[PDB]
Write an enzyme that holds these catalytic residues in place. Structure first.
Site, short mmCIF file in Angstrom:
data_model
loop_
_atom_site.label_atom_id
_atom_site.label_comp_id
_atom_site.label_asym_id
_atom_site.label_seq_id
_atom_site.Cartn_x
_atom_site.Cartn_y
_atom_site.Cartn_z
N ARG A 45 0.86 -1.20 0.00
CA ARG A 45 0.00 0.00 0.00
C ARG A 45 0.89 1.25 0.00
O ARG A 45 2.01 1.23 0.56
CB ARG A 45 -0.93 -0.03 1.21
N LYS A 92 -4.36 6.71 2.31
CA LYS A 92 -4.02 5.66 1.32
C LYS A 92 -4.31 6.13 -0.09
O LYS A 92 -5.39 6.74 -0.33
CB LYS A 92 -4.82 4.40 1.62
N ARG A 104 -5.33 5.66 -3.89
CA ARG A 104 -6.19 4.76 -4.69
C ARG A 104 -6.47 5.34 -6.06
O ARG A 104 -6.32 6.54 -6.26
CB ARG A 104 -7.53 4.51 -4.01
N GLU A 138 -8.40 -6.21 -12.83
CA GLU A 138 -8.40 -7.18 -11.72
C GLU A 138 -9.82 -7.42 -11.20
O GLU A 138 -10.22 -8.59 -10.95
CB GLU A 138 -7.47 -6.69 -10.61
N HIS A 148 -8.66 7.78 2.79
CA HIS A 148 -8.06 7.43 1.48
C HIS A 148 -8.46 8.46 0.44
O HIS A 148 -9.41 9.24 0.63
CB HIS A 148 -8.37 5.99 1.06
N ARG A 162 -16.55 -12.32 -7.49
CA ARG A 162 -17.01 -10.93 -7.67
C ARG A 162 -17.99 -10.91 -8.85
O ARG A 162 -17.70 -11.54 -9.91
CB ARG A 162 -15.79 -10.06 -7.96
O1 LIG Z 1 -15.38 -1.69 -0.73
P1 LIG Z 1 -15.46 -3.09 -0.42
O2 LIG Z 1 -15.33 -4.07 -1.67
O3 LIG Z 1 -16.60 -3.58 0.58
O4 LIG Z 1 -14.16 -3.46 0.46
C1 LIG Z 1 -13.06 -2.58 0.64
C2 LIG Z 1 -11.85 -2.94 -0.22
O5 LIG Z 1 -12.26 -3.00 -1.56
P2 LIG Z 1 -12.09 -4.33 -2.46
O6 LIG Z 1 -11.94 -5.49 -1.59
O7 LIG Z 1 -10.99 -4.04 -3.47
O8 LIG Z 1 -13.44 -4.23 -3.19
C3 LIG Z 1 -10.76 -1.94 0.04
O9 LIG Z 1 -9.65 -2.23 -0.77
P3 LIG Z 1 -9.18 -1.21 -1.94
O10 LIG Z 1 -10.21 -1.16 -3.07
O11 LIG Z 1 -8.90 0.16 -1.32
O12 LIG Z 1 -7.78 -1.77 -2.49
P4 LIG Z 1 -7.36 -3.05 -3.41
O13 LIG Z 1 -8.47 -3.05 -4.55
O14 LIG Z 1 -7.41 -4.20 -2.52
O15 LIG Z 1 -6.04 -2.56 -3.98
C4 LIG Z 1 -10.29 -2.04 1.49
O16 LIG Z 1 -9.19 -1.12 1.73
C5 LIG Z 1 -11.45 -1.71 2.37
O17 LIG Z 1 -11.06 -1.85 3.76
C6 LIG Z 1 -12.65 -2.63 2.12
O18 LIG Z 1 -13.71 -2.10 2.84
P5 LIG Z 1 -14.38 -2.95 4.15
O19 LIG Z 1 -13.96 -4.40 4.25
O20 LIG Z 1 -14.14 -2.00 5.44
O21 LIG Z 1 -16.07 -3.06 3.79
P6 LIG Z 1 -17.22 -1.89 3.54
O22 LIG Z 1 -17.32 -1.86 1.96
O23 LIG Z 1 -18.59 -2.60 4.11
O24 LIG Z 1 -16.86 -0.55 4.27
CL LIG Z 2 -15.33 5.66 -0.92
F LIG Z 3 -6.50 -4.94 -5.36
MG LIG Z 4 -8.29 -4.44 -6.05
MG LIG Z 5 -10.44 -2.49 -4.64
MG LIG Z 6 -4.97 -3.73 -5.33
#
Ligand SMILES: O=P(O)(O)O[C@@H]1[C@@H](OP(=O)(O)O)[C@H](OP(=O)(O)OP(=O)(O)O)[C@@H](O)[C@H](O)[C@H]1OP(=O)(O)OP(=O)(O)O
Ligand SMILES: [Cl-]
Ligand SMILES: [F-]
Ligand SMILES: [Mg+2]
Ligand SMILES: [Mg+2]
Ligand SMILES: [Mg+2]
Ligand SMILES: [Cl-]
Length: 135
Positions: free
Chosen positions: A3, A11, A13, A62, A84, A108
């Site tokens: 990250r 963070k 994104r 992805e 973020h 997904r």
């Molecule tokens: O938004 P969600 O799909 O529920 O979960 C996100 C996750 O997203 P993904 O798992 O990719 O969809 C974020 O990851 P991020 O998109 O920033 O990075 P990568 O794609 O992994 O690079 C995490 O950072 C974050 O914590 C999670 O949110 P959560 O588990 O707190 O759930 P909620 O969506 O209910 O707030």
């Molecule tokens: Cl958001």
């Molecule tokens: F990811």
């Molecule tokens: Mg991702």
């Molecule tokens: Mg993501």
């Molecule tokens: Mg990623």
């Protein structure tokens, strides 16, 4: 999967608004990983020294299994609650791939939404993502 962070500790994104065509009338959302009955804009973390437009296209491949013609930066959006900061780009989808990384790995889902329906499904748990479409 390292990250990365802005100087304020947010963070970094990137994400794309994945439109079905240049008319920008329908957009592709993907299922939440945490709550699969909910919809989100596909996006994720920038890798070290990764250009934001490169991270956006990579995360969309992805998570959503699509490729296309990168368009304009829409804006940079903070989530104060979750700390973020997301670069959001237009992507005009030209390739829809079967069996993409997150379909195989976490089941997904993805679906086309008219813009006003995307804003509706995002509002409750992703109001900042709903705000991506205000412009
Ligand atoms: O938004 P969600 O799909 O529920 O979960 C996100 C996750 O997203 P993904 O798992 O990719 O969809 C974020 O990851 P991020 O998109 O920033 O990075 P990568 O794609 O992994 O690079 C995490 O950072 C974050 O914590 C999670 O949110 P959560 O588990 O707190 O759930 P909620 O969506 O209910 O707030
Ligand atoms: Cl958001
Ligand atoms: F990811
Ligand atoms: Mg991702
Ligand atoms: Mg993501
Ligand atoms: Mg990623
Ligand atoms: Cl469209």
């Amino acid at each position: 999967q390292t990250r990365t962070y802005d100087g304020d500790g947010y963070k970094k994104r990137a994400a794309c608004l994945c439109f079905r065509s240049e008319s920008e009338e329908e957009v592709l959302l993907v299922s939440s990983s945490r709550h699969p009955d909910r919809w989100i804009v596909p996006g994720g973390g920038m890798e070290p020294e990764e250009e934001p437009s490169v991270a956006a296209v990579r995360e969309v491949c992805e998570e959503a299994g699509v490729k296309g013609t990168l368009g304009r930066l829409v804006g940079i959006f903070e989530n104060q609650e979750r700390k973020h900061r997301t670069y959001v780009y237009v992507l005009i989808v030209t390739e829809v791939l079967e069996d993409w990384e997150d379909s195989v790995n976490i089941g997904r889902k993805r679906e086309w939404f008219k813009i006003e329906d995307a804003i509706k499904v995002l509002q409750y748990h992703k109001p900042v993502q709903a705000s991506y479409f205000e412009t």
